[PDB]
């Protein structure tokens, strides 16, 4: 009927983490290679993603219990959960009014089409928007949003994962804090938790769709040379 | 006492090549990651160099006799001669008035110091300027400038080179056209040829100094992640 310290301290760490690794002004985006509307958006979006990965790694490093895992398991979790963490956090900039990520003047306002100029179709780009909408509508609290990202990152079901027993416990601790929170601090959210977990299953699918499309793109050297070393390494298979 | 067709046709190809691969307005530079004056210039200059390599490969592909070499020998020559070709061509933007490469407003006006913010010192950055000055003062014709780059690219003395006998003949054909040209079309340039060849020996040194400094930088992952795949690959040793 009331959250305990360890839990409350878990929420404080995660929220501070997201804050130290997510800017609501999107000021660093000018440092990226400029957008251009033949895979013309590829250079900008590669920098966007590569940037975000550094952020996700920053957030992860501060997820309680994560630094305790082995370098190998940390890397296995990041690599597999990375793309999804990026989709979850991107929701912050998503705009239901225009069905696009609004991160600045018309320049940094990424709509479904600018992603196509980055090597992606619409058949697979449709579920992303479908996902960004349902997630948005959940009007999550920063606490639940931040938790969901931490819960998603500690999914034991990741190819490459060793200590799937510990990683499993951690995720359970997090899922519990998310349930208690929603229960005591989130009025009207009785179905919520279950809706949030469902969102992770969707991420799996979007994750698998990206892998495929990225695989083709990364295989063509004229395109991969547009990617950044960090991306090439995080989405690469040389594990 | 007068150039022959094959020679004249060699000069026409090289000049057209340089033209199709060198812009005197430097308009594409806005596409690079913006400059910033902790290796703050590294992101911009990496894009500058990576860009230039694509250009050098474009020029090379059109050097007469080059496409006839084996993929392997083409790659061996590019990799080893790349950095030097970049220093030779950069001379076009060098400004003796301010001892810097002027490629745009204060933004793209790279002076000796902005390179330091890219992982380089002054002990080794001094010979580059010393070299850019002497070269500039030679007031080369576009024909001699273009030749020199072709002659430099066909230096048989490159680690990795197989057919060092053919590559050797090609370079000789080019050195001959450069001598005839200077002799019949370049009044007052009696010492020139010899001065130009000396410039290649200097490139060797600058080339060796870069290798070392780049090696350190590329070894530190926090820095290499700033480089581009093409650079990482051209200056890398995985031959």
């Amino acid at each position: 009927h009331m959250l305990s310290d360890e839990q409350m301290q878990i929420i404080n760490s995660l929220v501070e983490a997201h804050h130290k690794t997510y800017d609501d002004s999107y000021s660093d985006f000018v440092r990226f290679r400029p957008p251009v509307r033949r895979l013309s958006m590829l250079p900008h979006l590669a920098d966007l993603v590569s940037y975000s990965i550094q952020k996700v790694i920053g957030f992860a490093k501060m997820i309680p219990g994560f630094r305790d895992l082995t370098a190998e398991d940390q890397i296995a979790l990041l690599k597999s959960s990375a793309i999804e963490i990026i989709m979850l956090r991107s929701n912050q900039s998503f705009s239901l009014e225009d069905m696009s990520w609004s991160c600045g003047g018309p320049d940094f306002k990424y709509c479904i089409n600018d992603v196509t100029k980055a090597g992606h179709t619409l058949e697979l780009l449709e579920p992303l928007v479908k996902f960004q909408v349902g997630l948005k509508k959940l009007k999550l609290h920063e606490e639940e949003h931040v938790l969901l990202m931490a819960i998603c990152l500690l999914s034991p079901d990741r190819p490459g994962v060793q200590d799937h027993v510990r990683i499993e416990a951690l995720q359970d601790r997090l899922c519990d804090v998310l349930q208690a929170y929603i229960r005591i601090q989130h009025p009207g959210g009785r179905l919520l938790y279950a809706k949030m977990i469902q969102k992770l299953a969707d991420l799996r699918s979007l994750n698998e769709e990206h892998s495929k499309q990225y695989r083709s793109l990364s295989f063509q050297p004229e395109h991969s040379m547009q990617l950044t070393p960090l991306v090439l390494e995080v989405f690469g298979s040389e594990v | 006492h007068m150039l022959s067709d094959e020679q004249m046709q060699i000069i026409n190809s090289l000049v057209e090549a340089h033209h199709k691969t060198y812009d005197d307005s430097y308009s594409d530079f806005v596409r690079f990651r913006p400059p910033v004056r902790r290796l703050s210039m590294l992101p911009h200059l990496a894009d500058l160099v990576s860009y230039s390599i694509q250009k050098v490969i474009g020029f090379a592909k059109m050097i007469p006799g080059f496409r006839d070499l084996t993929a392997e020998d083409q790659i061996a020559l590019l990799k080893s001669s790349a950095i030097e070709i970049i220093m030779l061509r950069s001379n076009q933007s060098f400004s003796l008035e301010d001892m810097s490469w002027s490629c745009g407003g204060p933004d793209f006006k790279y002076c000796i110091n902005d390179v330091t913010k890219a992982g380089h010192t002054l002990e080794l950055l001094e010979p580059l300027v010393k070299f850019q000055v002497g070269l500039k003062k030679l007031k080369l014709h576009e024909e001699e400038h273009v030749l020199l780059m072709a002659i430099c690219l066909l230096s048989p003395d490159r680690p990795g080179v197989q057919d060092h006998v053919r590559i050797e003949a090609l370079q000789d054909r080019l050195c001959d056209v450069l001598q005839a040209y200077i002799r019949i079309q370049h009044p007052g340039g009696r010492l020139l040829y010899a001065k130009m060849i000396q410039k290649l020996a200097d490139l060797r040194s600058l080339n060796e100094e870069h290798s070392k400094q780049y090696r350190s930088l590329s070894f530190q992952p926090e820095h290499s992640m700033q480089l581009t795949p093409l650079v990482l690959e051209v200056f890398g040793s995985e031959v």
């Binding site: 370098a71 040389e238 | 992952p221």
Partner: peptide
């Protein structure tokens, strides 16, 4: 190897 990813995780 994961050169980059290793350095980043500190």
């Amino acid at each position: 190897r994961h050169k980059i990813l290793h350095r980043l995780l500190q």
